[PDB]
Amino acid sequence: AKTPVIVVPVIDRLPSETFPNVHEHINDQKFKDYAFIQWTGGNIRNDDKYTHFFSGFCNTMCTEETKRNIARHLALWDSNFFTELENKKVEYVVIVENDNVIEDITFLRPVLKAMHDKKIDILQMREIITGNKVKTELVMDKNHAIFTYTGGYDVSLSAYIIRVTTALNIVDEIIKSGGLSSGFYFEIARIENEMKINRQILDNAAKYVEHD
Ligand SMILES: [Mg+2]
């Protein structure tokens, strides 16, 4: 059962630029270890039914820009594709916005194994909060240690690995609780905390996933 590796377009360029050293083709989708995919749903105007991701209010309304960015992900988490991955017992998906570059995907294999073994639900592959962190070793890649630290109020959806049922549970709770309103990323953090979801931040993420 292959691990989906999903490119989410946020700028206009080919998905091959995100994975410049992958020698295959990346297939589109809407509505050897890896299945490379580009997810094209969840986009702006086509969202009369993404309204349940957000509360009725906020300001006058939330900016179409902030909503659009998070909607792309929530739509993916809430897709028939994901529920089918749950049916098919696929454990994790790798999700990367296409303004990132991952030159070397070999780190993913030992990282995914270690995540499985250590019951990690989310590996966030972009850092947000600066300052000293409490690191723990995740796994050794060739001759270098890969470290993580526990996530807090530093959610980013730029690039991450997530357990399929974890993604499904989060977006379902968002829908249940009436949609996001203000402090989108804070609320995602709180939902994860309430569910005792284990989110780790990849330390020195920039080494593995270069952000544009
Ligand atoms: Mg990004």
Side-chain angles (χ1 to χ4, degrees), residues 1-24 26-30 33-43 50-56 61-63 66-67 69-87 89-112 114-209 211:
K2 286 184 183 177
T3 291
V5 171
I6 307 165
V7 176
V8 173
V10 298
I11 57 179
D12 196 334
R13 78 189 190 188
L14 295 184
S16 56
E17 285 194 34
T18 299
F19 292 102
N21 289 310
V22 170
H23 315 307
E24 296 163 27
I26 317 190
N27 276 4
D28 292 13
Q29 178 203 300
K30 226 177 182 180
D33 271 337
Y34 306 110
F36 286 87
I37 303 169
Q38 186 167 220
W39 161 259
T40 68
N43 278 245
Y50 295 149
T51 64
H52 63 336
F53 295 153
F54 307 102
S55 76
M61 281 296 169
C62 297
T63 61
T66 43
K67 279 166 65 170
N69 253 77
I70 192 162
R72 291 194 187 98
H73 291 269
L74 300 181
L76 175 57
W77 300 358
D78 195 37
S79 65
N80 301 322
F81 180 52
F82 261 52
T83 53
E84 286 162 16
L85 298 176
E86 190 177 51
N87 295 343
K89 298 198 281 186
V90 174
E91 194 174 13
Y92 297 113
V93 303
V94 179
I95 295 173
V96 184
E97 291 188 340
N98 75 344
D99 62 344
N100 293 292
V101 180
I102 302 181
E103 297 182 5
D104 186 6
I105 69 165
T106 61
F107 78 102
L108 288 176
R109 184 171 172 239
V111 160
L112 285 162
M115 287 176 68
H116 170 80
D117 293 346
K118 286 183 157 64
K119 306 293 198 292
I120 296 176
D121 301 315
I122 301 170
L123 181 69
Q124 182 173 305
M125 299 196 296
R126 177 181 188 194
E127 303 187 70
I128 299 285
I129 288 179
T130 60
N132 297 345
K133 346 140 186 186
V134 182
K135 316 176 177 194
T136 186
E137 177 171 17
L138 174 66
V139 71
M140 283 249 309
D141 186 36
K142 37 152 183 186
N143 268 28
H144 285 66
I146 296 176
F147 297 94
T148 65
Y149 53 93
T150 292
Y153 299 107
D154 58 350
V155 171
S156 166
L157 302 166
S158 183
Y160 58 99
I161 309 177
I162 185 159
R163 184 185 305 279
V164 176
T165 57
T166 294
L168 296 165
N169 287 345
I170 295 169
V171 65
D172 290 354
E173 172 58 39
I174 291 173
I175 291 168
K176 176 179 179 171
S177 73
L180 304 173
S181 56
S182 64
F184 295 169
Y185 292 120
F186 285 149
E187 179 166 3
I188 290 173
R190 296 197 291 274
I191 288 170
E192 298 180 4
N193 287 345
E194 298 154 23
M195 297 193 181
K196 288 137 69 173
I197 285 163
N198 180 6
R199 176 166 54 93
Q200 290 298 308
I201 314 300
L202 178 61
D203 189 67
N204 201 20
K207 165 182 166 68
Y208 306 88
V209 179
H211 186 60

